[PDB]
Amino acid sequence: PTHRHIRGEACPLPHRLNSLGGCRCGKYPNLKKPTVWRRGH
Ligand SMILES: [Zn+2]
Numbered sequence: 066p067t068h069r070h071i072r073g074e075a076c077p078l079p080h081r082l083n084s085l086g087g088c089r090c091g092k093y094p095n096l097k098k099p100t101v102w103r104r105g106h
């Protein structure tokens with residue numbers, strides 16, 4: 066799938082973010098920001 070950027074995080078890989086801007090696998094919580102769909106990289 067497409068991984069989301071929380072806008073200014075230096076790419077949250079290799080963790081997979083959902084629509085709330087975080088990864089259920091402990092690393093990124095529910096920040097809820099205008100998250101950008103990035104998968105061109
Ligand atoms: Zn990225």
Ligand SMILES: [Zn+2]
Binds near residue numbers: 080088089092
């Ligand atoms: Zn994670």
